[PDB]
Amino acid sequence: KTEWPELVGKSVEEAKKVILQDKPEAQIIVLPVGTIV
Amino acid sequence: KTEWPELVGKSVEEAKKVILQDKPEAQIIVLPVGTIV
Amino acid sequence: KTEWPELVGKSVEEAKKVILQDKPEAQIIVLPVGTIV
Amino acid sequence: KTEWPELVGKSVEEAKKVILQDKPEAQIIVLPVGTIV
Amino acid sequence: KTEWPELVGKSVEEAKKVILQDKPEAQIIVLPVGTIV
Amino acid sequence: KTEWPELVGKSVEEAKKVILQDKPEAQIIVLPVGTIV
Amino acid sequence: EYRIDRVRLFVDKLDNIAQVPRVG
Amino acid sequence: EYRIDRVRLFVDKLDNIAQVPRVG
Amino acid sequence: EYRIDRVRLFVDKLDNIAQVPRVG
Amino acid sequence: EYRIDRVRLFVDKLDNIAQVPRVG
Amino acid sequence: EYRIDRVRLFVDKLDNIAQVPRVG
Amino acid sequence: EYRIDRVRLFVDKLDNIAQVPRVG
């Protein structure tokens, strides 16, 4: 499970709750769109 | 219906209401002009 | 009437009022100097 | 009088008051250092 | 001890407390992800 | 005295007080790390 | 990523649409 | 996109017009 | 650095997910 | 655009002049 | 400048460490 | 412009000096 296309448009909270369900060890990083990585 | 030229200059609210009428499944993303995509 | 050199240094309000007088159909966009277009 | 080297480090207020004394018609623009012009 | 992979996802406070334990002389700098160095 | 390596990690206040002691005529400019000069 | 159901809105300092909205 | 009815205003930190406004 | 346990979320001005989240 | 009557002031985080002001 | 005693922390919008901290 | 009497301080999110201050 490496991607969540179904999360586009949902809030950070909803997204956090979905990813932690599928990937309990996830380290969630929240950045502004356009942040150069 | 892939573009809304008639929405230039209108507020985000007005724009949201117009697009959802024409495209009920739209996932609306609001970014600052100039955000590098 | 495609340019307003006389508006450099004036506030957004004053500028809005001037342009709408000369161009009633104008869609006024307010961005930070340096926004890459 | 096209430059004010003596204003480096002074506040915007002090700077405004100095330039208007030397150049009454100046249109003063205040931008963050690093704004790409 | 030049890196702390175990700190990804933890708060700045927790991170500060961990690094100072391992490296008492550390000078801790806190920057936004994407700051060009 | 053209550099202050001993000031890395200290606050702006502490830094201001140190530099003015060593260089009374300094014009202190405070910018965000990463500001393109 | 071209997403047929996404519509990005690029807003100005007053939150007015600055550019023509398009799907993608 | 050149839009004949759009006028972008580029403002400074005090919201004063910084550059000559033009249609487009 | 590819980190198998990290998930970056890229958010819009309203904190909605703007792009498809992926591990890395 | 070189404007003989414009003076841009580039300010630091504390609003102090950071660079030598010049007309233009 | 490589400084053996400096540790830069790169933080996300919620101030969580986004990248592996390293000395330098 | 190299100014012998200017000292730029580059600060982090907590206003701590991030880089070695130098004149210029």
Curated annotation (Swiss-Prot), chains A, B, C, D, E, F:
Role played: Inhibits both subtilisin and chymotrypsin.
Entry similarity comment: Belongs to the protease inhibitor I13 (potato type I serine protease inhibitor) family.
The name this protein goes by in its record: Subtilisin-chymotrypsin inhibitor-2A
Organism: Hordeum vulgare (Barley)
